[PDB]
Design a protein around this ligand. Structure first.
Ligand SMILES: O=c1ccn([C@@H]2O[C@H](COP(=O)(O)O)[C@@H](O)[C@H]2O)c(=O)[nH]1
Ligand SMILES: O=c1ccn([C@@H]2O[C@H](COP(=O)(O)O)[C@@H](O)[C@H]2O)c(=O)[nH]1
Lengths: 208, 208
């Protein structure tokens, strides 16, 4: 599918401090939440409009309201929770589901481990969120997880992504669009995005 | 100058409930604040970017930060304060100035009455805010007020505006751009925008 880069100068600005190694855990946490809300605005620019008829204190009028559709925000444990409340600010109605993944010794990919979703799965559109899209491993497992439960609308959103990871998602799931804030250049032997921002989880929780 | 209409479906959605006569003062207040923050995002999409060199926990990097410029938010008493904090959320650094206007018995236009601005006036760009742009009377008086103090960058932003009021501003100040969320059709004998939303001040403060 297509990848959308959100280049708003405010996102770009906050992203810079998010990357800087000197930004402590508290600022990091707060900055990600902010960039999360900002991207939520850009992404929801799609929401279908239906027009009703209201009546202001002056006269009647033809206004518009949001189409009426169910939304689902699903963070990938653990660094994923860092971007939920930010999105929930704009869409308080959206339901929140979580997904855990485990990794085995001699394997090349993560695997579904813990899944909790809202019961109306078949109906609502979902947005899987995770700060980093590296090898695409965790993202793919997560989407496979959702498709298996029958959600037919899946979008992925992250701050920073690596080419390989984007390709991994394209290949495995061409029907899923990707929303990123920046596309870095590559991965290193340990799987970190370069230049990236280090370990999202540690920077967020300030703990292991 | 040019008028920019922000048609984001979220703004359109919230605007509808803002107009509805049945929305009580508390929701109104809160809804305006929200639409204010949302418009603040759209308007600041301009902010110039300068690129610095940071160093993430993984490697060095070339990032961008906001140009560095001073901003001023100036509400027109009284319904103007309803949109300040919403904007301040995105730009906490911006300074806040107020402007009061009085009206005399046999006159056709408002007039500067109370003015308090940050001292760096000559330097910073300002955004005058007021929920409604009706006859354009109050807006013009307000801009005249700022130009007289030597601010050379002035933008006007409101929720709903009437054609006459837009024209009034164009005529009196062609160098000021206008940012609105909706352009209604006309004014009635009492000066209210049709369909509009009634008296912004009463709906906001719930008092006279
Ligand atoms: O530089 C990186 C790369 C990955 N991850 C995290 O490691 C997990 C594995 O991503 P992936 O390698 O499966 O793409 C994801 O939860 C992601 O947030 C980071 O925190 N920093
Ligand atoms: O329908 C309207 C028209 C105007 N005003 C308020 O009355 C003042 C006068 O605007 P104007 O007639 O000078 O344009 C402004 O502060 C504006 O917010 C309203 O509350 N509702």
């Amino acid at each position: 599918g297509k990848v959308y880069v959100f280049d708003h100068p405010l996102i770009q600005h906050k992203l810079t401090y998010i990357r800087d190694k000197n930004t402590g855990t508290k600022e990091f946490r707060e900055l990600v939440d902010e960039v999360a809300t900002l991207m939520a605005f850009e992404i929801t620019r799609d929401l279908p409009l239906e027009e009703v008829e209201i009546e202001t204190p002056v006269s009647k009028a033809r206004a518009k309201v949001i189409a009426g559709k169910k939304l689902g925000v699903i963070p990938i444990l653990r660094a994923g929770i860092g971007m939920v409340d930010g999105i929930l600010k704009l869409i308080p109605a959206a339901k929140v589901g979580h997904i855990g993944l485990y990794r085995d010794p001699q394997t090349l990919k993560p695997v579904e481990y813990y899944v909790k979703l809202p019961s109306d799965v078949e109906e609502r559109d979902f947005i899987i969120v995770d700060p980093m899209l590296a090898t695409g491993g965790s993202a793919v497992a997560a989407i496979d997880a959702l498709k298996k439960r029958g959600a037919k609308s899946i979008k992925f959103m992250c701050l920073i992504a690596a080419p390989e990871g984007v390709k991994a998602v394209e290949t495995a799931h061409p029907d899923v669009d990707i929303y990123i804030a920046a596309l870095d250049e590559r991965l290193n032997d340990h799987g970190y995005i370069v230049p990236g921002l280090g370990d999202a989880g540690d920077r967020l929780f300030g703990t292991k």
